[PDB]
Amino acid sequence: MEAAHSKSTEECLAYFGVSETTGLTPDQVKRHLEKYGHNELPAEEGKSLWELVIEQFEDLLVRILLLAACISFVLAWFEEGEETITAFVEPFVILLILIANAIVGVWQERNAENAIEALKEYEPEMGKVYRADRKSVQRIKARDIVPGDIVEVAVGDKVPADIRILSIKSTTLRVDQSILTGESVSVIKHTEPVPDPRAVNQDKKNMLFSGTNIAAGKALGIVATTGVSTEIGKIRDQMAATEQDKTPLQQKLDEFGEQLSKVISLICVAVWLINIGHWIRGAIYYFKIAVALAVAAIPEGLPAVITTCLALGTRRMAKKNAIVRSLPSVETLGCTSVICSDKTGTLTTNQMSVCKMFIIDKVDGDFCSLNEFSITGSTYAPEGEVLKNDKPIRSGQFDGLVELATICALCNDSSLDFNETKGVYEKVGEATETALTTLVEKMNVFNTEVRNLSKVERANACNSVIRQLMKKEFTLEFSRDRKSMSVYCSPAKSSRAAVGNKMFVKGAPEGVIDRCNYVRVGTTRVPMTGPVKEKILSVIKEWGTGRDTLRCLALATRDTPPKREEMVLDDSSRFMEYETDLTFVGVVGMLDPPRKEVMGSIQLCRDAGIRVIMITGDNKGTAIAICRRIGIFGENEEVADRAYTGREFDDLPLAEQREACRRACCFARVEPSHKSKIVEYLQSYDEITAMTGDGVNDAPALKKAEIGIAMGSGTAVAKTASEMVLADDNFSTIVAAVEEGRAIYNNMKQFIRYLISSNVGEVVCIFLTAALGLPEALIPVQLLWVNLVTDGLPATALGFNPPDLDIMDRPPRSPKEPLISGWLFFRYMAIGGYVGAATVGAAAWWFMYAEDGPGVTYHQLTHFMQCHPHFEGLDCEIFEAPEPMTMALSVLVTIEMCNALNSLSENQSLMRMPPWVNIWLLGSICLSMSLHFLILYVDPLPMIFKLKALDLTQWLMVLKISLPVIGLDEILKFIARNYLEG
Ligand SMILES: C/C=C(/C)C(=O)O[C@H]1C(C)=C2[C@H]([C@@H]1OC(=O)CCCCCCC)[C@@](C)(OC(C)=O)C[C@H](OC(=O)CCC)[C@@]1(O)[C@H]2OC(=O)[C@@]1(C)O
Ligand SMILES: Nc1ncnc2c1ncn2[C@@H]1O[C@H](COP(=O)(O)OP(=O)(O)OP(=O)(O)O)[C@H]2OC3(O[C@H]21)C([N+](=O)[O-])=CC(=[N+]([O-])O)C=C3[N+](=O)[O-]
Ligand SMILES: [Cl-]
Ligand SMILES: [K+]
Ligand SMILES: [Mg+2]
Ligand SMILES: [Mg+2]
């Protein structure tokens, strides 16, 4: 039954054809099951391990790096293998790296908890239905509840289906709908049809939504929808539907990878360009250079280096209490352009606070004076002080304030509890009432010593003094008609009727103040006149529709109550006349106040070019008032077309909506799906958006946003949906979390540039040793070992570079900003040209012009393949020698050690930026050298690798070749800052 909130109770009973008095039939329930299925959100299952590993292989660079590992296996099989059988295992290192880099990724994806299973925790197991099967109530499996069933709910029950209320058997039925509206105050339901067929859950006061739970009362209803078709079912349907996008950086690495897949295909054509005429050996040569061509092109270990860089940011962030569940999100938080954030529980403490209160002062003539007070503290904890005119006063010095707190402590069902496990006070009962309980604690009316109390005894210390002052005989409950409630108290002394027993009354100000024939002035009573009533009804309207928009409760007493045996308590309708001839005492103003640090944190995002949008299910006038307090709006700023309710927003034509999401800062009366749209719209303008929330109703927006941030105090659902938890609930840690993102990516830019322009030299070299007939090509094992650990250690040290000073004064980077720019392309083309020649020039220097180099002949080194009169006097097996290739390896090692010293800063001299500033960089160069020394001096490693040679002079030669790269860059660096300024 769709739109059941708008039809009558008879109409709903008629829609299915049932009476309340007797349920559905076994005939009906069987047919309904076959029509509507069972009552359950369907579980969503993760990917199988087979289908998870396969996803690692979809990337092209690993799809071609896999292809090169296979090609190596064949070459390993052939007699070059069998000449040196032990050292054919270079593919296994390739394969092992592909297996490792894939295994860390699957563990990244395998370790993950399900936010839909977290939602199904709101499905109750059992349900109470009346069916025609039997006369009594029937407790059955809630998944067997079909629509049209008659169901019953009492205190503490989870509502098992979306239910239209038929009969509220208690006085009020109070429901906790935080799962849909994000609010915590109990909603008072009714049975009258709500007509608008496009009313939001906040307006559907006659509905009971599956997942929500009953706070107080008992009710009977008829099921409107079961299973996925329910408001909570729409939440997960939009949660399973959303699909998280590719990181902007991972887009570039896919962009970059997609181009190597093409430029690798092209260099293989230029090798075949050797057709200038002006079989196993020929085959092996085409392949043995193709494999090394791929190994020299794709930056292996860059996935390894990137992973450990984020993993350390995860570790440093946890020091600042930001728990990062997804490692790729530590950089996307830097380019956050917009921050969408929930209100209650996020920007505010979600703890009702009594900010202001007043009582009468003077009443003479048409003049009426009020004592107005201010109460500090933004939490249920009894911490905070009462102020009059911003100077602290002692509440118990005002006789009117004594009565005000007595009414607050006695006309109250709520309590205060200190959770020793959590270390924080928690409400016991209604949020609205618990606020009054905390007020009495802050305003220690009878001056009870509370400094030495344990934290558990402090919770109710002051209320318990008042409880022992007067005995609470009975309580006239809250009822919808009068919007008021009362308690009947007897003095519990020997004075009895002389000191007199009293009625204490609290409720909506209009209803109470009408039934107030007197006005309390301290101890004395004065008749309620026109002027006095207006003066108090004036201030209430000011506190109601002001810059402080506060729910006001009127506190009155009845000094001469009716006779205890004269009042009947079966009937909630006589209660209003019972609460008559009252004496007005005072008024209190309530607010879920913003967290201490939220305001300043917003100003910091504004300073960093990040806007903040509030999106709340709370009433609009309240969200606007919290917005002014936070700084989203000005204190006197006339919000006009800048704050919309979900309905007003939905009423705009689709075109105007996207423009609204760019100019509007506040959104209220919002259903869960409304938040996901606004995120989606902001994303349509291609700015990275961040969603902060804590409730279940935020899980759609938390998933859609590129970066979800859940509060620690929030629901599990919200955490499971998001990529970051604020352990300490400190909103300031978001601003700090961004700073890390901006800083990391800057360092990521360096070690990506550093590791890539290292890869570009390995292709210039491998091409030179292939275009010209040079024997000495770098062996793939060297490129691997260097690109993995010899280049890995330095690149990771670029991750520790100092951050920029203005890092938080620049606007967010464009997500499509390219890493290698225009000149920086040339700068690395020139750097790539050098290191490409420096490794191949060493190769020739051994044979041609060296004392231990027997070859010489240069022109014959270029044509050494055939190997007799042209090769006479020289051994052919001397070209396989390991000594001529150490220079190539040691050139590349020393130049990339030096190129890493150029990577500590783009476009800036190291004469001006000494490597001292990054001490980590220098130590990492040492270990790559110390490990390089190891790969040259221990038989198991110089057998796979090359042998040390010309130690006295070769080392000088490599150091003599590697120096000009610092000058090449330092000249290119000076060319850069001379031209960038103009
Ligand atoms: C030689 C080794 C590599 C890995 C290579 O070819 O990378 C190219 C390449 C794919 C790009 C280029 C490289 O371009 C060249 O190398 C041009 C000359 C090639 C001839 C050499 C043979 C004689 C990078 C290396 O810039 C330079 C320094 O030339 C990175 C850059 O931006 C990045 O991808 C950096 C972020 C990872 C990309 O041009 C990139 O392609 C893109 O899609 C871009 C736009 O992104
Ligand atoms: N934003 C808020 N700030 C402060 N309080 C809020 C706020 N929102 C709701 N409440 C309190 O919560 C109860 C929720 O009832 P509900 O039907 O949702 O009423 P609304 O006034 O909110 O109409 P609305 O949905 O906004 O159009 C109300 O009952 C009472 O105080 C109200 C109430 N009253 O409204 O008059 C009287 C009362 N006693 O005891 O007299 C107890 C309440 N209570 O415990 O929640
Ligand atoms: Cl509203
Ligand atoms: K997300
Ligand atoms: Mg919330
Ligand atoms: Mg309201």
Numbering used by the authors: 1 to 278, 288 to 876, 880 to 994
Paper's wording?
Here, a novel and rapid method to obtain experimental phases for protein structure determination by vanadium phasing is reported. Vanadate is a transition-state mimic of phosphoryl-transfer reactions and it has the advantage of binding specifically to the active site of numerous enzymes catalyzing this reaction. The applicability of vanadium phasing has been validated by determining the structures of three different protein–vanadium complexes, two of which are integral membrane proteins: the rabbit sarcoplasmic reticulum Ca2+-ATPase, the antibacterial peptide ATP-binding cassette transporter McjD from Escherichia coli and the soluble enzyme RNAse A from Bos taurus. In order to test whether vanadium can indeed be used for experimental phasing, we collected long-wavelength X-ray diffraction data from three known protein–vanadate complexes for V-SAD phasing: two membrane-transport proteins, the antibacterial peptide ATP-binding cassette (ABC) transporter McjD from E. coli and the rabbit sarcoplasmic reticulum Ca2+-ATPase, and a soluble enzyme, bovine pancreatic ribonuclease A.
